[PDB]
PDB file of C-alpha atoms and ligand atoms in Angstrom:
ATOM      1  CA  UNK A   1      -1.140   5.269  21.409  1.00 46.38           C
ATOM      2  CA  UNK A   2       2.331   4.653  19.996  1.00 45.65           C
ATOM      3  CA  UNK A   3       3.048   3.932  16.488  1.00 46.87           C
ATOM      4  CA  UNK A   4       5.445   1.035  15.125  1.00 49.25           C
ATOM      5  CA  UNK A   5       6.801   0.819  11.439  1.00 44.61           C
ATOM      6  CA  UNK A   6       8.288  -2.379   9.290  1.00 41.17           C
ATOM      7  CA  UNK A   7      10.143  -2.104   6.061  1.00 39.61           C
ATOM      8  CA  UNK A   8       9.141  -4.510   3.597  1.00 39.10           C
ATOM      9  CA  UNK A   9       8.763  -5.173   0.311  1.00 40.76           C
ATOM     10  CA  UNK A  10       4.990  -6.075  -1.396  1.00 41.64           C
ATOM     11  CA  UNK A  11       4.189  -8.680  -3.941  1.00 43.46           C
ATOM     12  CA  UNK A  12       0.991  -9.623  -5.361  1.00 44.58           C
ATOM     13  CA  UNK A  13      -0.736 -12.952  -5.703  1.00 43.29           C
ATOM     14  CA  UNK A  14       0.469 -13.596  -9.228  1.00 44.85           C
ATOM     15  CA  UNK A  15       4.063 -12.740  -7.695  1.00 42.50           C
ATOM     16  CA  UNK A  16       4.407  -9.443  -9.438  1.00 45.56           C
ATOM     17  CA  UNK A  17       7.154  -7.324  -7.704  1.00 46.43           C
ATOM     18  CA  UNK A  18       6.154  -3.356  -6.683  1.00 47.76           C
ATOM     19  CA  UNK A  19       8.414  -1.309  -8.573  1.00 46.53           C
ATOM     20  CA  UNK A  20       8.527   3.056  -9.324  1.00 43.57           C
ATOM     21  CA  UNK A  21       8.050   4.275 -12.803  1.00 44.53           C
ATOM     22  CA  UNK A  22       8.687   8.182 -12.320  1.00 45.31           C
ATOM     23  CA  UNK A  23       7.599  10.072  -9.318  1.00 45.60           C
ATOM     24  CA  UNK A  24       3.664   9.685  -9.397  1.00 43.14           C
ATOM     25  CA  UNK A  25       3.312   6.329 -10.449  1.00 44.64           C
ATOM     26  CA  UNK A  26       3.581   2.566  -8.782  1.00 44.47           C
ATOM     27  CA  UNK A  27       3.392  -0.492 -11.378  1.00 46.05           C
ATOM     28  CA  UNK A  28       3.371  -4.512 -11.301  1.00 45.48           C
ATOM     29  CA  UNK A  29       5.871  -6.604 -12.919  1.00 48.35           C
ATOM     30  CA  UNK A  30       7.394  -9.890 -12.583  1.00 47.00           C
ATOM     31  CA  UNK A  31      10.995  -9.163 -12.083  1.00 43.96           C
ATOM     32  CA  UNK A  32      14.256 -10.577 -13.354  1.00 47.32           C
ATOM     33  CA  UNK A  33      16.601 -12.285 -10.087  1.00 44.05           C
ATOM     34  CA  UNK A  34      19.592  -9.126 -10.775  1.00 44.57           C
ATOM     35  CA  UNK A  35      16.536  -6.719 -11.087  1.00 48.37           C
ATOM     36  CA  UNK A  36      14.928  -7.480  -7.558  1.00 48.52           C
ATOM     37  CA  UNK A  37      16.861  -4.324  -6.150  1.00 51.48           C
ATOM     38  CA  UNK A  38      14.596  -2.500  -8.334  1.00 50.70           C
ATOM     39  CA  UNK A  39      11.904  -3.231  -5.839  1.00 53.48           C
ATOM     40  CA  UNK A  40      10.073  -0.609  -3.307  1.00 53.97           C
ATOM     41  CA  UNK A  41      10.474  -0.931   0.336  1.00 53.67           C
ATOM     42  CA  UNK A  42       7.958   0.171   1.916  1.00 51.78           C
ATOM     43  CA  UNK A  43       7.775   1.703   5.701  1.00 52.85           C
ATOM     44  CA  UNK A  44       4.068   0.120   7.210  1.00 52.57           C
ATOM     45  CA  UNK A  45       3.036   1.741  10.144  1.00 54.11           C
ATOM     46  CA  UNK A  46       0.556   0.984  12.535  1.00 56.53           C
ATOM     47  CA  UNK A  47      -1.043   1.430  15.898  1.00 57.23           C
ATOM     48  CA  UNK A  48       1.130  -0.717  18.458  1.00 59.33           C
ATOM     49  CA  UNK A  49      -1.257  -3.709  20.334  1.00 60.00           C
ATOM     50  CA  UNK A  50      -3.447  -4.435  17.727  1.00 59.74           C
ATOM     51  CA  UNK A  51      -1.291  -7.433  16.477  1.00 60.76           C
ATOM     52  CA  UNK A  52      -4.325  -9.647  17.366  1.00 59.38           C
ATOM     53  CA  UNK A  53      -7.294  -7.375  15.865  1.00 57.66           C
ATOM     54  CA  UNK A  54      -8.651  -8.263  12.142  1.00 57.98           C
ATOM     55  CA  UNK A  55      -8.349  -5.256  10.601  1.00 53.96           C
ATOM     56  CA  UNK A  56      -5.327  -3.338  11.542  1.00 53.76           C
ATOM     57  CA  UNK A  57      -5.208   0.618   9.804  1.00 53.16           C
ATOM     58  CA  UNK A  58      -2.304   0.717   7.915  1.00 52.29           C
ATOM     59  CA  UNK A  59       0.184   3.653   6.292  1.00 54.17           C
ATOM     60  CA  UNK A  60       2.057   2.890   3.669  1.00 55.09           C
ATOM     61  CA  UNK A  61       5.081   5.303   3.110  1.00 56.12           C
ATOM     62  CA  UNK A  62       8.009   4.701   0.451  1.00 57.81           C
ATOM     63  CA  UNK A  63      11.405   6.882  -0.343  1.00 57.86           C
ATOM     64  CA  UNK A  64      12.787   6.613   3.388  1.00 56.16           C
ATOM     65  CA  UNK A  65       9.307   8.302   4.034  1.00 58.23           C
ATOM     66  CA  UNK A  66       9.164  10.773   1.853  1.00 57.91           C
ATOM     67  CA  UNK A  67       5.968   9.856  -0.109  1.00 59.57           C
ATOM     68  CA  UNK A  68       2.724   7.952   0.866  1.00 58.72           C
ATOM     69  CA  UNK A  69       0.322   6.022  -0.912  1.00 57.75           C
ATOM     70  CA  UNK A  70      -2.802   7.866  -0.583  1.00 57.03           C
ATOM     71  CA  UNK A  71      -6.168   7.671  -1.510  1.00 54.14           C
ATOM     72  CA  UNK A  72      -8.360  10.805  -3.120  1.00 56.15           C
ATOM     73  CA  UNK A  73     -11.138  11.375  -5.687  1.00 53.24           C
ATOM     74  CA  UNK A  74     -10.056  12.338  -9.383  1.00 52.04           C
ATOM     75  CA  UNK A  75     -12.783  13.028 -11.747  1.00 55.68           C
ATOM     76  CA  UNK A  76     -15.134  11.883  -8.897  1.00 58.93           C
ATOM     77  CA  UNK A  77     -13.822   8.221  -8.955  1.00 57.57           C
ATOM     78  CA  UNK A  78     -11.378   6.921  -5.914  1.00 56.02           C
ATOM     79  CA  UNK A  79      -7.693   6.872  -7.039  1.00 56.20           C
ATOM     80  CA  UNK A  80      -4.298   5.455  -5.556  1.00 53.67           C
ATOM     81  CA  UNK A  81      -1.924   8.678  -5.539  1.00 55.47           C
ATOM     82  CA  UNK A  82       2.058   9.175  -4.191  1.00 54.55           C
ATOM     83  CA  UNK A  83       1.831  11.762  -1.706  1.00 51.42           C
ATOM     84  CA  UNK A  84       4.531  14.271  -0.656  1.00 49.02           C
ATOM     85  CA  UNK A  85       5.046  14.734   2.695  1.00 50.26           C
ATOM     86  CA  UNK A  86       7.574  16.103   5.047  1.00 51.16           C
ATOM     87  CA  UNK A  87       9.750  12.748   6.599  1.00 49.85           C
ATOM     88  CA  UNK A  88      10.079  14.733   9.348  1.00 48.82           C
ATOM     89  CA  UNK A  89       6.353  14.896  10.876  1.00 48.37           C
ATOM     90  CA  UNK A  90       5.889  11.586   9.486  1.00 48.90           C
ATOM     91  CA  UNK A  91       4.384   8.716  10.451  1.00 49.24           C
ATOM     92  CA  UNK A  92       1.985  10.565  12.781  1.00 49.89           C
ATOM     93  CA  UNK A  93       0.274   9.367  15.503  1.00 51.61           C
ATOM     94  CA  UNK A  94      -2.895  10.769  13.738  1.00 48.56           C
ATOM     95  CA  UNK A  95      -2.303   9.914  10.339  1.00 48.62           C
ATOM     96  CA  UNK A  96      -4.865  11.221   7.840  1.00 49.49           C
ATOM     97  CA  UNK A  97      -7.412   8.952   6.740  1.00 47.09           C
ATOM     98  CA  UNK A  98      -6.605   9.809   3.147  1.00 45.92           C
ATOM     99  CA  UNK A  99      -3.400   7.595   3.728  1.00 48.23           C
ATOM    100  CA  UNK A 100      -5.006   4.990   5.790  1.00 49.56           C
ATOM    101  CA  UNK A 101      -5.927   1.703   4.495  1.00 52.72           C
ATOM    102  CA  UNK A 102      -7.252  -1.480   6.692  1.00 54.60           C
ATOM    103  CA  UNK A 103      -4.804  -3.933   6.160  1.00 52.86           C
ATOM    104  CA  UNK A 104      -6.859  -7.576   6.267  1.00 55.48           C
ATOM    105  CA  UNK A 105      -5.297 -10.886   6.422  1.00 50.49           C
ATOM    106  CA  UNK A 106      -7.584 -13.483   3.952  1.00 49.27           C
ATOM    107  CA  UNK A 107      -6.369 -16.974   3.369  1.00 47.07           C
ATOM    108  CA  UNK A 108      -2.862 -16.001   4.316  1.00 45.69           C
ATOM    109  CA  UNK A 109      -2.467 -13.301   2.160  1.00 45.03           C
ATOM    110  CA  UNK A 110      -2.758  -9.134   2.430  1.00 43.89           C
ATOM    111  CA  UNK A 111      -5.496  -7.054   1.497  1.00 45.15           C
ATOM    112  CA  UNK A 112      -5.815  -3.444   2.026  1.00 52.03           C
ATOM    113  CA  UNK A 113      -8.895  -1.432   1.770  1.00 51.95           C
ATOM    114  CA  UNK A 114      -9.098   2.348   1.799  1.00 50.04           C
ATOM    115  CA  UNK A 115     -10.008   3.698   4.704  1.00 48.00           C
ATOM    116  CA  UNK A 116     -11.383   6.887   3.138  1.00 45.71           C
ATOM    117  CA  UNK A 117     -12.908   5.134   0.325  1.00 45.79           C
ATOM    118  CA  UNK A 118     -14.719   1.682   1.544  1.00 44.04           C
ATOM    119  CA  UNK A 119     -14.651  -1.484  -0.595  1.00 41.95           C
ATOM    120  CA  UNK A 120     -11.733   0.236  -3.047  1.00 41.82           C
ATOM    121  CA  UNK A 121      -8.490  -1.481  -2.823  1.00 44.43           C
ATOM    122  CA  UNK A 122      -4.835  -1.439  -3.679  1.00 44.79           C
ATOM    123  CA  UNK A 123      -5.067  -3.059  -7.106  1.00 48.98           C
ATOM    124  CA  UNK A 124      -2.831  -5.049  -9.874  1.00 45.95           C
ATOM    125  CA  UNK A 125      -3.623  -5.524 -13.108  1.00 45.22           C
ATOM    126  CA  UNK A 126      -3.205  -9.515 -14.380  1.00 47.12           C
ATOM    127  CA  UNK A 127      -1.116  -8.066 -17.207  1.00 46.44           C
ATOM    128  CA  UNK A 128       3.035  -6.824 -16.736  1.00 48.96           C
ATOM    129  CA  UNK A 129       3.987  -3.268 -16.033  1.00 50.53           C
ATOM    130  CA  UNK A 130       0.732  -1.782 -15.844  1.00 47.55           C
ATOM    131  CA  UNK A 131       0.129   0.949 -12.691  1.00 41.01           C
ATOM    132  CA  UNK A 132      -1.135  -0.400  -9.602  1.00 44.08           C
ATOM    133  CA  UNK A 133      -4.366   1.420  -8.820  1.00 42.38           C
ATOM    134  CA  UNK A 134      -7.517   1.670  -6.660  1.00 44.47           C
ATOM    135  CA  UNK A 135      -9.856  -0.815  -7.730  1.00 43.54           C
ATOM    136  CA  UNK A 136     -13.741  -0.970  -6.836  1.00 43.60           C
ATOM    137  CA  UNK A 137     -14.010  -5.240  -7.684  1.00 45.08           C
ATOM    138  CA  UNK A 138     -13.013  -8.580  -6.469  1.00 42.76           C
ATOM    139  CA  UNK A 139     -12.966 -11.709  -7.879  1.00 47.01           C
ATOM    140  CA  UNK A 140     -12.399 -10.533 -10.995  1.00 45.92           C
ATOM    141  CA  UNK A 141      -9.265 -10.466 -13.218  1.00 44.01           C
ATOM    142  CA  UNK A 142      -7.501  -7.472 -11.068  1.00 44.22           C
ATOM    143  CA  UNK A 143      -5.530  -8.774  -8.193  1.00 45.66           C
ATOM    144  CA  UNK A 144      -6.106  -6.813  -4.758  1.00 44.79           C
ATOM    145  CA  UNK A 145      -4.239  -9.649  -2.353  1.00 46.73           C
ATOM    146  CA  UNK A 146      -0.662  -9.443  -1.965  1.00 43.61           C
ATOM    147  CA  UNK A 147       1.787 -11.157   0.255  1.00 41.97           C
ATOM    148  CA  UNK A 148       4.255  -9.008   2.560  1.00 45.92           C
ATOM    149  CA  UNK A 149       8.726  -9.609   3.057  1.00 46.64           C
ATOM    150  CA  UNK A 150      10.406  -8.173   5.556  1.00 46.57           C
ATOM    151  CA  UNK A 151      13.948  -6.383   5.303  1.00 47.59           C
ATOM    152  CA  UNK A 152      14.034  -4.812   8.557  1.00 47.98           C
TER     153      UNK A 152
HETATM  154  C1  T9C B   1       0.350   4.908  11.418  1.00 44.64           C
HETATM  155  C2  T9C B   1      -1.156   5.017  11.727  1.00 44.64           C
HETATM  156  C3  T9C B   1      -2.098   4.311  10.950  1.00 44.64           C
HETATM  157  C4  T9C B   1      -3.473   4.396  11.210  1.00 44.64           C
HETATM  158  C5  T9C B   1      -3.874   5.246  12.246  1.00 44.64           C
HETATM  159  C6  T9C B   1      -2.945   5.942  13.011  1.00 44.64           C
HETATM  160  C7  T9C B   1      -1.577   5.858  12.773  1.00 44.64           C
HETATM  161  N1  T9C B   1      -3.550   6.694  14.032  1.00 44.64           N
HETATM  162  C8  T9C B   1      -4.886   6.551  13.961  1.00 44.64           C
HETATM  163  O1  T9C B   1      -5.706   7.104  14.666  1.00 44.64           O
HETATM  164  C9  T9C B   1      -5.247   5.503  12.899  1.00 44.64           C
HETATM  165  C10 T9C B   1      -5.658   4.296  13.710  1.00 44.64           C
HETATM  166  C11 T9C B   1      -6.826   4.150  14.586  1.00 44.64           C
HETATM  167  N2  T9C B   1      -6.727   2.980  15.062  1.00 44.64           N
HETATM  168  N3  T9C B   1      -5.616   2.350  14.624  1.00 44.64           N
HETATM  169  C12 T9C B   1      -4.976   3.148  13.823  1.00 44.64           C
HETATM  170  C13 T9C B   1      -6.286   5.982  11.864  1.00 44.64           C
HETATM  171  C14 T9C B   1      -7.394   5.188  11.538  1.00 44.64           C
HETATM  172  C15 T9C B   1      -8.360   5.670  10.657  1.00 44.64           C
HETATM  173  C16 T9C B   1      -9.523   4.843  10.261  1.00 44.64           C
HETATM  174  C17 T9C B   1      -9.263   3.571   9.744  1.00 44.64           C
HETATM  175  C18 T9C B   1     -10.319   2.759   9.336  1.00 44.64           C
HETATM  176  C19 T9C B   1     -11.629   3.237   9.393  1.00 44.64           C
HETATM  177  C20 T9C B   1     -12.765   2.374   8.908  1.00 44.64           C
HETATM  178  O2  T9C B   1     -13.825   2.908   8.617  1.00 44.64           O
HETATM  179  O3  T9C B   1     -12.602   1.056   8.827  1.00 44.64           O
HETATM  180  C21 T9C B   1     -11.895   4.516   9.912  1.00 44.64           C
HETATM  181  C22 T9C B   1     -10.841   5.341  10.322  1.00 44.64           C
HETATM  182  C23 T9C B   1     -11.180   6.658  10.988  1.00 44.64           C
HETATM  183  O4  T9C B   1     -10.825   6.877  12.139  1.00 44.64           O
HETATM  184  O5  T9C B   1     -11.905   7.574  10.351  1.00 44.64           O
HETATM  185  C24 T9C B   1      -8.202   6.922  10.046  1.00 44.64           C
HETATM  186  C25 T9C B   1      -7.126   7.734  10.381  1.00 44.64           C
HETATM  187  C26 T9C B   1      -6.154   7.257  11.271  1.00 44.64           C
HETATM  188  O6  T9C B   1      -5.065   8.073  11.573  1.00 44.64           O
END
């Protein structure tokens, strides 16, 4: 089955732009309006025909594909990780599931929980610039919905 992509850019509930802060590292802030360029787009892929389904796998790439957000144990505990991968190869039609997350739409808003690692999601702290992470708890003071903008 064929894969489609969208470039976008991801905000969380509290309207906290994505931005980089080096090469390993994603974190949350609330932007200025002449920052906003400062914000990552994103390349989501996906399976093509499952526009109707409720959970819809997900890869989330960044750097005109030359990183993915990926999901892998450190110090035995699920973490949120910038992987590097060849743009070439990329996105598969097989992606691995360490890059996969299952993209749910609640209440109008994005979730997305890792594939690999169930009920551990992408994660924002309520405070500014802090990383976003994989976090194990909702309903509590981290953030895991987000809302999605396309640019292409
Ligand atoms: C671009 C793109 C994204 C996502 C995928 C592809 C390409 N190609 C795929 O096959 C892909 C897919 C299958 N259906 N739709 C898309 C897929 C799904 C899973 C997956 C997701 C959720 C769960 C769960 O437990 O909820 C289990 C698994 C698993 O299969 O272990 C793992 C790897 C994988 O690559």
């Amino acid at each position: 089955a064929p894969v489609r992509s969208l470039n976008c850019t991801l905000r969380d509930s509290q309207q906290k732009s994505l931005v980089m802060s080096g090469p390993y590292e994603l974190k949350a802030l609330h932007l200025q309006g002449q920052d906003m360029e400062q914000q990552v787009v994103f390349s989501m892929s996906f399976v093509q025909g499952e526009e109707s389904n409720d959970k819809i796998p997900v890869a989330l790439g960044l750097k005109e594909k030359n990183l993915y957000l990926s999901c892998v144990l450190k110090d035995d505990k699920p973490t949120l990780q910038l992987e590097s991968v060849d743009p070439k190869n990329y996105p598969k039609k097989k992606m691995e599931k360490r890059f996969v997350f299952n993209k749910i739409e609640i209440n109008n808003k994005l979730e997305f929980e890792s594939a690999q690692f169930p009920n551990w999601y992408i994660s924002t702290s309520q405070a500014e610039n802090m990383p976003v992470f994989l976090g194990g708890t909702k309903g509590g003071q981290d953030i895991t919905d987000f809302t999605m903008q396309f640019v292409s």
